[PDB]
Design a protein around this ligand. Structure first.
Ligand SMILES: [Cu+2]
Ligand SMILES: [Cu+2]
Ligand SMILES: [Cu+2]
Ligand SMILES: [Cu+2]
Ligand SMILES: [Cu+2]
Ligand SMILES: [Cu+2]
Ligand SMILES: [Cu+2]
Ligand SMILES: [Cu+2]
Ligand SMILES: [Cu+2]
Ligand SMILES: [Cu+2]
Ligand SMILES: [Cu+2]
Ligand SMILES: [Cu+2]
Lengths: 298, 298, 298
C-alpha cells in the first residue's frame, strides 16, 4: 500500500473510564505500526493502538461498553468486533473511514475471555495483518477456585504470515506462531506477538503458587493445543465461563478465537515452558517461559 | 472417469416413511450430479440424491432405520455409513454395485447431530467428491432449553478440492470451504455446499428470538471453529447429546464429523455473519448470513 | 547424522518395579532403531527402548516415579518429559548425554492418559523422529463406568515426516499418520506406529462387549478426530480424568498431546474400522481395525 510506505505511527495508550455502575467508555485507535515479530523481522502491522495483539480490555459482566474507534490509517477503513457483546454486526461493527471516528454501544452480558478483532471485509486480511486482541469479562460471582489462585497473567496466541499477502493468508502455512502477554496489574509485562520476548523475559512466579492464565488463540487460522510443561491444569473453564469446568487436563484445545481460564500449580523452582503442543507452531515461535523462584522476583 | 463424462443425474427426492412406533424406512440414491460450488465453478459431484451435502434425515431416538441405497452411478460402487447407528460395518455398511440396490437395518439409539457418508474405499475419495450429510436423532426427553427456542435451522460445513484429485484430497489445502442449510420444516431453505447461496439468501429470524442451530462439520479434512458474529452461544450440546452441556461459548470447536446443537439470542435488527473462525476457510467461502428483522420476513 | 549410519539398536525391554506403596522405578533407553512405518519404508527412528511410540507406562495415582534414562544414542543427547508429573522442567527434564544415564524423580498426582516425549531442543525434531509415548495414571477411585467394561486396549496416533527433515517437520504435510497399540495385559498386541499392522492383525473383541480404549494423539503437529465406525461412544473422559465426563459422542476431538478414555459397545459381529475422521490422515495410514466375533478369538 503506497500510503503506508514509511508510516510508523507511535503506539497510543488505550483510554477507558467507568461512567456508571454498569457502563464503561473505551477509546481505541486503528493505526499502522512497525513491530519486530522475530529477530530482525519487522512487520508493518495493522493494529489497534500500536500493539499486536491489541491492548487488553477488562470489563465486568453486565457492563455496557460505549466504544469509540479513531481510525488513524491514512487509506484503509477499519472496524471493531468484540466477541463479548450482543450487537447488530451490520449496524454496530461497521467501518470507520480514514481520519474519522465512530462510536458504538453494546452490552457484555457473558463472563469469559473473548477475542476482539477488526470486522472489515476481507476480515482475514485485517486479522492476519494484526488487528486482533482480547477482552476479559469478569464473572459477577467469580470462579469457584478464586480463593486458591496466587498469581495471574494473560497470554494470547497468534500467527504471522508473509506481509499483506492474501494468497499466503488463505493457502500458506504460518511463518511464525507467537505468544504475547497483556498486563492485568501494574508491573505485569505487556508485550506484542513475537518469537522471543517471553523467552528472554519470562513471566515470573513463586514456588508453590497456583497460577491462573487467561488465554485466547486469536488465529487467524490455526487451532491451539495449549500446554504448560511440568504441570497439569488443576481446573479449566472453557471460554472463561465458570460453568464449563474441566479438571486435570494436560492440554487444552482452543479453536480459532477460543479462550479459556486455566489454573495450575508450580511445585519446584525452575523455568517452565508454555507451548502450543502442535510442535511445528512451537518451533516457529510459540514457546513462552515461566520462571519460578523461591522469592518470585528475577 | 469416462463413464461420468456428460452425466448429470437430476436430483431425486429423499423417501422416508414411518412403518412402526420405532421403525422408519429411508430410501436414498447414489448419483452423479453437477453442483455450482462457487460462481462459475461446476463440480460433478458424487452425491446422495443429487445434493451435496445430502438430504437431511431426522428420526427419533430409539428408531430402527430400514435403509435402502439405490446406486445410480454407472460404474462406481457406493455405500452408506450413518454415525447415528450401531451396526456391523463389514455387513451393514457394504457396497451397492452400479444399477443395484441394497437394504440394511440398524438402530439409532443415541440422540444428536450425526454425520453420514459413503463408506467405500477409499473413503476420502467418496466424501471429498460430495457423499456426506447429516442425520438428526431427536432426544426422547428433548433438551432442557427446548421451551426457550423460537426458531431453528440446520447448517453443515464441508470442503471442496480439485476435482476427483486424490493427491489434492490427501495433501492440498481446500479450494473452497462452505456452509449449506437443510430444511427442517416447510419453507426452510434447502441448499448445497457453495460459497454464495447463504450470503445472497440469508437465513431469516426476528429481533429478540433465541435461535437453535443443528450443526455438523463433515470435513472431509478440516476442523471447524464455529462462531456467530454479534452473539454468544447461550447453550451448547456437544454432538447434540443433552448431557454434554456448555454455556456462554463464543466459538464451538468441531472435529471432522463433529456435531453440536447451539443456541443464541439475536438482540438487534441487522445481518449476522456465521463463520468458521479459521479465517482462511471463511475467506474461501465459509460465511453464511442470518438476517434479523422486526417482522422475521425478508 | 554420520554417527547414525548403519545403526540399528535392538529393542530393549522397559524395566519397571514398585519400590514402595507410592513409589515406582522406571528405566528406559534412548536408542536409534529401524522401524517399518509403511510397507517397504524404513524410518531410522529416534526412540525410547526401540519402539515408536515408546513402551506403555502404567502407574497409580499418587505414585512418585523414579525415572532413569540410559542414552544409547552415540551422538545426540536426549531427555524425558512426562505430562503426568509435576516437575521442574529445567531441573528434572534435562538432557542425558550419549553413553550416560540420568535419574529424575517426580510425582504423578493426576489420573489420566498422558503423553510423554523427549524434551531436548528442538523438541519438534525429537518428537517427529519418534520420541513419544503414553503414560497412564490409574484413578484411585476408578471410573464410574468401570463395572460395565468388558475389554480394554490402548491406541496412540502419531505422524511421520520426511526423514529428519526439519523443514518438512515445520512446514510440510505428514507423509503418514498412524495408529499403534500398546499392551496392558499379557496377550495384548504391542505394535509401532505404522500404516498396516492394526489392519492386518486387528484388535479382537466379542459380540456385545463394551470396549474401553485409552487413547492419546501424540502428534507432533496434527489434531485428531477420533471415531470408531459402527458405534457411538457411550462415555468419554477427557484426558482420562473421571470428572471430564461426556456421553454419546460420535467423535472425540483430541489436541496434539491430548488423551481420552472412550467406551463403546459393539453390537454385531464384523470388522469395525477405527479412524481419525480427518480423512486425509486416515488415507495416509490412520485406520486401525477391531474384529468382533461370537467367541472373541481370531
Ligand atoms: Cu457513553
Ligand atoms: Cu483493520
Ligand atoms: Cu470474530
Ligand atoms: Cu497458593
Ligand atoms: Cu422395513
Ligand atoms: Cu460414493
Ligand atoms: Cu464416519
Ligand atoms: Cu424468545
Ligand atoms: Cu528410587
Ligand atoms: Cu530425543
Ligand atoms: Cu509435552
Ligand atoms: Cu458387557
Amino acid at each position: 500500500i503506497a500510503a503506508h510506505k514509511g508510516v510508523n505511527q507511535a503506539p497510543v495508550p488505550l483510554k477507558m473510564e467507568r461512567v456508571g455502575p454498569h457502563d464503561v467508555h473505551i477509546e481505541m485507535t486503528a493505526q499502522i505500526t512497525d513491530i519486530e515479530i522475530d529477530k530482525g523481522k519487522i512487520y508493518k502491522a495493522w493494529t489497534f493502538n500500536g500493539q499486536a495483539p491489541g491492548p487488553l480490555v477488562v470489563v465486568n459482566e453486565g457492563d455496557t461498553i460505549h466504544f469509540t474507534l479513531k481510525n488513524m490509517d491514512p487509506v484503509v477503513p477499519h472496524s471493531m468486533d468484540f466477541h463479548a457483546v450482543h450487537a447488530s454486526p451490520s449496524k454496530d461493527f461497521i467501518d470507520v473511514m480514514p481520519n474519522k471516528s465512530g462510536t458504538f454501544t453494546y452490552p457484555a452480558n457473558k463472563p469469559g475471555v473473548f477475542m476482539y478483532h477488526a470486522g472489515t471485509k476481507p476480515v482475514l486480511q485485517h486479522i492476519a495483518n494484526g488487528m486482533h486482541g482480547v477482552i476479559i469479562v469478569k464473572p459477577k460471582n467469580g470462579y469457584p477456585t478464586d480463593k486458591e489462585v496466587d498469581r495471574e497473567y494473560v497470554l494470547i496466541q497468534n500467527e504471522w504470515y508473509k506481509y499483506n499477502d492474501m494468497n499466503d493468508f488463505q493457502n500458506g502455512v504460518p511463518s511464525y506462531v507467537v505468544f504475547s502477554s497483556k498486563a492485568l496489574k501494574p508491573g505485569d509485562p505487556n508485550t506484542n506477538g513475537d518469537t522471543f520476548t517471553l523467552k528472554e523475559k519470562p513471566l515470573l512466579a513463586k514456588v508453590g503458587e497456583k497460577i491462573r492464565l487467561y488465554i485466547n488463540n486469536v488465529g487467524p487460522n490455526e487451532v491451539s493445543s495449549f500446554h504448560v510443561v511440568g504441570t497439569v491444569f488443576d481446573d479449566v473453564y472453557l471460554d472463561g465461563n465458570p460453568n464449563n469446568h474441566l479438571q486435570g487436563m494436560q492440554t487444552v484445545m482452543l479453536p480459532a478465537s477460543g479462550g479459556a481460564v486455566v489454573e495450575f500449580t508450580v511445585t519446584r523452582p525452575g523455568t517452565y515452558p508454555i507451548v502450543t503442543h502442535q510442535f511445528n507452531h512451537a518451533q516457529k515461535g510459540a514457546v513462552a517461559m515461566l520462571k519460578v523462584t523461591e522469592t518470585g522476583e528475577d
